[PDB]
Amino acid sequence: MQIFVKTLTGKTITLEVEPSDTIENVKAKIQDKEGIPPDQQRLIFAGKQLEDGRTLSDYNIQKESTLHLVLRLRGX
Amino acid sequence: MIVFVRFNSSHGFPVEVDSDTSIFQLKEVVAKRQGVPADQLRVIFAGKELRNDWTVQNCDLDQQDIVHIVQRPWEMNATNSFYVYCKGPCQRVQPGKLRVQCSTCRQATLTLTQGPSCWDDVLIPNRMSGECQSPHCPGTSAEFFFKCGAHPTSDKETSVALHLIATNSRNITCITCTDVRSPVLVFQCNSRHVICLDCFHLYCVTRLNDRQFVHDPQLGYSLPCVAGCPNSLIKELHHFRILGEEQYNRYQQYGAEECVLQMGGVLCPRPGCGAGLLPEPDCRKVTCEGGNGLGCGFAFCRECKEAYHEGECVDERAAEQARWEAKTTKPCPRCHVPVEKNGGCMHMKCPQPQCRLEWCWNCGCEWNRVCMGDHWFDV
Ligand SMILES: [Cl-]
Ligand SMILES: [Zn+2]
Ligand SMILES: [Zn+2]
Ligand SMILES: [Zn+2]
Ligand SMILES: [Zn+2]
Ligand SMILES: [Zn+2]
Ligand SMILES: [Zn+2]
Ligand SMILES: [Zn+2]
Ligand SMILES: [Zn+2]
């Protein structure tokens, strides 16, 4: 299934995903497209911070739904 | 006189009206300002919808007050326990079909030990036990999924169950407009207050514009009962898909914005940026570094939000009527012996040794796949 990842900046990232894919796998799929290390990445769905070990099914994220991408910045 | 209008934004804009200007005329002003038809506009002021014959003065609308404008165009049959949000072709709330499959093989081979009696049984995963009828498979638990029943559906073409929406069978008046509409949204407040889908749109849209949605880190961004009842926040947040794609995306955007803040970060202050930045616990310098996105790439003070410096900077009566709960037996359809129903599950088994008819409590027919699909349990 296809999902989207939007920054509050207005940038939309297209991901190919499964409902069984963890937030950790999703964070890995973002790094493979945008080169952002997953420790910098923080995902939000419907105002809730998504935890690494949970899946897409667990938050009920559907085919063609959007997650928000927010960034932890160091040095911041 | 200047009154401030919020129309699908938390950014209020000024409008010039007089004390004797009617709400019909206020609507005409807003219609001209947004290039929208006036008949499609609803005026909401401090929870109440203002009607067309009232004047600005009557509604106690003083200089620099906030009004909202929400654009809104004006046995035999099936009984539906479950409603879903069909993302297409319907793009709306439709009655759905409950389905089962094995947790293991993910096939319709799992025969349940007993049927679901409530939403917890079908919403919490691996809460129900059964036996997979396929030979080589150790499937002990069931997996329930929902489908839109309005059209013919594919295997993987599932939809989120909107467990709050119920068909208004007992003809309960809405908490806000006091009318009888169906389906309704039923809140999980102790009074189980019922709101029609039109009033619910008005409640969410105005609350969104006001930034009056609640943030709970363990839930996200939601709203309680209209009446304000404690412990009543909407838990399944796809319920807001009822507002339509445009409002839903705005709700998701405001929610992410509230989430960032609740986590202690910041939003980039530069025009049109607003990047969700999470600076380290002890930081005053924050850099909107993107290079792609969240590319700004501004460096600002976490406090003053200027460029980084070094130094310092409801009706009680209506609510009473709008409650979901405010005769015990049915005969078996074959032997006519009355049976008392225990719990919410619709699958009855006659205890008469000569009979033992398996039938639907709701329909009074023998138990089938349609009754399981349409209403395995009652609400
Ligand atoms: Cl009422
Ligand atoms: Zn549909
Ligand atoms: Zn199986
Ligand atoms: Zn209503
Ligand atoms: Zn309530
Ligand atoms: Zn920025
Ligand atoms: Zn400062
Ligand atoms: Zn019987
Ligand atoms: Zn039935």
Curated annotation (Swiss-Prot), chain A:
Disulfide-bonded cysteines: none
Glycyl lysine isopeptide (Lys-Gly) (interchain with G-Cter in ubiquitin) crosslink location in chain: K6, K11, K27, K29, K33, K48, K63
Locations listed in the record: Cytoplasm; Nucleus; Mitochondrion outer membrane
Site-annotated residues for Interacts with activating enzyme: R54, R72
Domain Ubiquitin-like span(s) in chain numbering: 1-76
UniProt-annotated site: Essential for function, residues: H68
Modified residues ((Microbial infection) ADP-ribosylthreonine): T66
Annotated transmembrane regions: none
Position of the Glycyl lysine isopeptide (Gly-Lys) (interchain with K-? in acceptor proteins) cross-link: X76
Sites bearing Phosphoserine, chain numbering: S65
Topological relation to the membrane, as annotated: Peripheral membrane protein
ADP-ribosylglycine modifications at: X76
Modified how: Phosphorylated at Ser-65 by PINK1 during mitophagy. Phosphorylated ubiquitin specifically binds and activates parkin (PRKN), triggering mitophagy. Phosphorylation does not affect E1-mediated E2 charging of ubiquitin but affects discharging of E2 enzymes to form polyubiquitin chains. It also affects deubiquitination by deubiquitinase enzymes such as USP30.
Outcome of swapping S65A: Prevents phosphorylation in case of mitophagy. Decreased localization of PRKN to mitochondria
Biological role: Exists either covalently attached to another protein, or free (unanchored). When covalently bound, it is conjugated to target proteins via an isopeptide bond either as a monomer (monoubiquitin), a polymer linked via different Lys residues of the ubiquitin (polyubiquitin chains) or a linear polymer linked via the initiator Met of the ubiquitin (linear polyubiquitin chains).
Protein name as it appears in the record: Ubiquitin
Organism: Homo sapiens
Swiss-Prot record, chain B:
Residue numbers binding Zn(2+) 5: C332, C335, C350, C355
Modified residues (Phosphoserine): D65
Consequence recorded when altering G344D: In PARK2; loss of self-ubiquitination; impairs PINK1-dependent localization to dysfunctional depolarized mitochondria; impaired E3 ubiquitin-protein ligase toward ZNF746
Effect after changing T111A: Loss of phosphorylation. Reduced mitochondrial localization
Positions of Zn(2+) 3 binding: C268, C273, C288, C296
Effect of R192C: In PARK2 and PARK; uncertain significance; impairs the ability to ubiquitinate SNCAIP and ZNF746; decreased binding to the TP53 promoter; abolishes TP53 transcriptional repression
UniProt-listed InterPro entries: BRcat_RBR_parkin (IPR047534), IBR_dom (IPR002867), Parkin (IPR003977), Parkin-like_IBR (IPR054694), Parkin_Znf-RING (IPR041565), Rcat_RBR_parkin (IPR047536), RING-HC_RBR_parkin (IPR047535), TRIAD_supradom (IPR044066)
Recorded consequence of changing M128V: In PARK2; uncertain significance
Impact when changing K147N: In PARK2; severely compromises the mitochondrial localization; fails to stabilize BCL2; loss of activity towards MIRO1
Family (UniProt): Belongs to the RBR family. Parkin subfamily.
Note: The parkin locus (PRKN), adjacent to the 6q telomere is hyper-recombinable and lies within FRA6E, the third most common fragile site in tumor tissue.
Protein name: E3 ubiquitin-protein ligase parkin
Designated gene of the protein: PRKN
